[PDB]
């Protein structure tokens, strides 16, 4: 969902 990286 969230851009972790």
Do not use: G, L
């Given at each position: 969902?969230?851009?972790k990286a």
């Amino acid at each position: 969902s969230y851009v972790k990286a």
